[PDB]
From a paper:
We, therefore, obtained crystals of Nek7WT apo and Nek7WT.51 in the same form as the Nek7SRS. All three structures have four chains in the asymmetric unit, and in each case, chain D has a poorly ordered N-lobe. The analysis, therefore, focussed on chains A–C. In contrast, the side chain of Y97 adopted the ‘up’ position in chain A of the Nek7WT.51 structure, and was poorly resolved in chain A of the monoclinic Nek7WT structure and was not modelled. These conformational differences might be explained by crystal packing interactions: chains B and C of the monoclinic structures form a symmetric, back-to-back, head-to-tail dimer that covers the surface proximal to Y97, whereas this region of chain A is exposed to solvent. A comparison of the apo-Nek7WT and Nek7WT.51 structures indicates that the presence of compound 51 does not alter the conformation of the R-spine. While the monoclinic structures of Nek7WT have two distinct conformations of Y97, all three chains that were fully modelled in the monoclinic structure of Nek7SRS.51 have the same conformation of Y97. The position of L180 in Nek7WT is also more variable than that of F180 in Nek7SRS, but the mutant still fails to achieve a fully stacked R-spine as indicated by the position and variability in the side chain of F180. Building on these observations, we generated a mutant of Nek7 with an all-aromatic R-spine that formed a partially stacked configuration in the co-crystal structure with compound 51, in contrast with the disrupted and variable R-spine configurations observed in the structure of Nek7WT crystallised in the same crystal form.
Numbering used by the authors: 21 to 181, 196 to 300
Amino acid sequence: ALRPDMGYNTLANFRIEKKIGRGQFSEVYRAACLLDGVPVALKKVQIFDLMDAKARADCIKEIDLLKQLNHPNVIKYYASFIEDNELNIVLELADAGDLSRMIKHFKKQKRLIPERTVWKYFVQLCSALEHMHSRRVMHRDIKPANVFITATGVVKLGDLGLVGTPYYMSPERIHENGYNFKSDIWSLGCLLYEMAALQSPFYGDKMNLYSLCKKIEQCDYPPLPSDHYSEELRQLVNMCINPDPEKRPDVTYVYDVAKRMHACTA
């Protein structure tokens, strides 16, 4: 059926086109609204038995804070509702593709990324991450697969969240301390590395869940080429993955560095 009285607040007002979202943790489909006609993507959480009352209310607690966020580099959250005992969220469409796939493109090509373009996208990201840190919200999970670039080139970021593993593990997310802001930029620091090396900084020789942690605790990661990447960057990455969080910068300083270095490369 169809009900315009509840615009964006029911799957009855959406024609799902493709399951453009991979994985079994959640299914994200690209759809088209049957009213205004704008294409939108919906995200379904199978939280019927995946979450418990104390958690269900905790998750609905976060999407509302996230709703209060208007930035051209953060994805627009249009509506939230629950039908079929599953959580539904409809946000802006990023059809062009993710940065994770954008890395793989070059990785298969065997042609590394120029220092000129990584700033072209990175600054945009920090702009967002600061806008979120301005509202005292943290992305929680910054990975190349959640940073979406449009066909035009604008940069927008995705959502947040048998041993489950975040892509970039914080040195404080190991000793089980709280996920603070200065850990949200740890993930961001490792992100800059992945664009210049096209693979995580701690991606292990013989993947080992434990040595990876000491490698994170000791900060023993493979340096980058002295020839192709500005030393401001190779020192900006090493500055953002300092184990002790106090010794790390704040988002806005990384924003400052990203901006000025973005103009020197043009």
